[PDB]
Amino acid sequence: MATDLIMTILPGMTVKVTNPNDTYYQFQGIVQRITDGKVAVLFEGGNWDKLVTFQASELEPV
């Protein structure tokens, strides 16, 4: 236990925003894409989509 896996983030997982400096702190969305150092998270309602990019260390799987 010198080496410990802390978390894995994959498309399709539900994630929460865990950075208390970010305006979306505590909100939950679904991971859509991981690319170029960013995690793209989707929030959706009736007839709208919003895609927001975070750094991995700002998120946690739920």
The whole-angstrom separation of Cα 2 and Cα 62 is 26
For this entry, resolution in Å reads 1.9
What does 21-40 look like in DSSP terms, one character per residue? TSTTTT-EEEEEEEETTEEE
Which range of residues forms the domain containing residue 13? 1-62
- What is the number of structural domains in the chain? 1
**Tokens found for residue 23:** 């305006």
Query: Could you tell me the CATH number of the domain that includes residue 12?
Result: 2.30.30.140
The whole-angstrom separation of Cα 36 and Cα 54 is 11
The whole-angstrom separation of Cα 48 and Cα 36 is 25
User: Distances in Å between the alpha carbon of 40 and those of 1, 4, 15, 46?
Assistant: 31, 25, 11, 20
